[PDB]
Design a protein around this ligand. Structure first.
Ligand SMILES: C[C@@H]1CN(C(=O)c2cccn2C)CCN1C(=O)NCC1CC1
Length: 119
């Protein structure tokens, strides 16, 4: 019932994600001028370094907010892929599965802790 525990759990999960080779495409923001069409497709860029920085700045209030940003990484990758014959999209789908399998308990524990606090 620790209301704050999600933060270190999310830091540890980001550490695992950064270690995963499947995160390579997503670790840093897209150079908009390198992939010049990117901002025509993607209204809100997101990447794992931004997520970590947001977390470390104390600018997430809940793991749900972090989750929303991580899921945006994946939706952006899907929106930008030209095909499934892309190593990047393939990596996004695997990393997404990994993230979702690991974030579920974080979310559950946090929401449980909040409920207990309000009981
Ligand atoms: C811009 C695209 C798509 N892409 C993204 O969308 C992205 C970057 C950070 C967060 N996200 C969600 C990944 C990088 N990428 C590439 O094509 N890199 C490999 C190309 C053969 C050279």
């Amino acid at each position: 019932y620790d209301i704050q525990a999600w933060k270190k759990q999310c830091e540890e999960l980001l550490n695992l994600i950064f270690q995963c080779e499947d995160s390579e495409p997503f670790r840093q923001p897209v150079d908009l001028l390198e992939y010049p069409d990117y901002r025509d497709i993607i209204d809100t860029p997101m990447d794992f370094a931004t997520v970590r920085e947001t977390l470390e700045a104390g600018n997430y209030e809940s793991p749900m907010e972090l989750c929303k940003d991580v899921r945006l990484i994946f939706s952006n990758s899907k929106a930008y892929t030209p095909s499934k014959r892309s190593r990047i999209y393939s990596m996004s789908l695997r990393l997404s599965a990994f993230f979702e399998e690991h974030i579920s308990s974080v979310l559950s524990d946090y929401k449980s802790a909040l409920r207990f606090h309000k009981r």
